[PDB]
């Protein structure tokens, strides 16, 4: 759980401008969130990555975790395995705003984050779930109690993000 380079926004959420895939890689964390759908079929933004860099190993893990088990729900996480990634993948989903899913589900979805002391973490429902970044990093921000290492890929959006919380 190295992480280097980051920028203090509050006592416990820290951000950089770093693909989060790079910083798994490098910090080798115990827990890293992947954005996810209910049913674990990783697309294109974070979650795809993340399989990517596993040569597909965490897709087949997910898919037979959801046939086993079933979907989960909005707002709903599990806990699989971070294969060369981390040591363990908090697989936690967004609401989707744009299909009209209730952002007040953000909100239950990163509690999710308080059960584990440190984890690397994209903004979730930031990209194809259509929510505005500001409002995730604020939601996050108020909700989340443990360490959280947020990773932006962006560099437009997070000097956007930086600013707005001055
Ligand atoms: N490699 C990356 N590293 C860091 N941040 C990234 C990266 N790729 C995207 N992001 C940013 O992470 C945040 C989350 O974006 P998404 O991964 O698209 O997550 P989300 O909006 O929750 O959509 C989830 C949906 O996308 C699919 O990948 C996934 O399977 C699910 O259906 C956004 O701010 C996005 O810009």
């Known amino acids: 759980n190295s992480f280097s380079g980051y920028l203090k926004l509050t006592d416990n959420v820290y951000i950089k401008n770093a693909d989060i895939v790079e910083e798994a890689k490098?910090?080798?964390?115990?827990?890293?969130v992947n954005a996810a759908n209910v049913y674990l079929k990783h697309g294109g933004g974070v979650a795809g990555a993340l399989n990517k860099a596993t040569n597909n190993a965490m897709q087949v893990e997910s898919?037979?975790?959801?046939?086993?088990?079933?979907?989960?729900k909005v707002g709903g996480s599990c806990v699989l395995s971070?294969?060369?990634?981390?040591?363990?993948?908090?697989?936690?989903?967004?609401?989707?705003?744009?299909?009209?899913?209730?952002?007040?589900?953000?909100?239950?979805?990163?509690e999710n984050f308080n059960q584990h002391e440190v984890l690397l973490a994209p903004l979730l429902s930031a990209?194809?779930?259509?929510?505005?970044?500001?409002?995730?990093?604020?939601?996050?921000?108020?909700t989340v109690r443990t360490n959280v290492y947020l990773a932006v890929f962006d560099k437009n959006l997070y000097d956007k993000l930086v600013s707005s919380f001055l």
Do not use: M, W
Not at 129 to 141: K, T
């Open 26 to 32: 490098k910090v080798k964390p115990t827990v890293v």
């Open 63 to 72: 898919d037979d975790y959801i046939a086993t088990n079933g979907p989960l």
């Open 82 to 110: 971070g294969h060369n990634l981390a040591k363990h993948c908090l697989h936690v989903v967004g609401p989707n705003v744009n299909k009209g899913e209730d952002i007040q589900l953000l909100k239950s979805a990163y």
């Open 127 to 142: 990209g194809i779930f259509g929510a505005d970044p500001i409002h995730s990093l604020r939601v996050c921000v108020d």
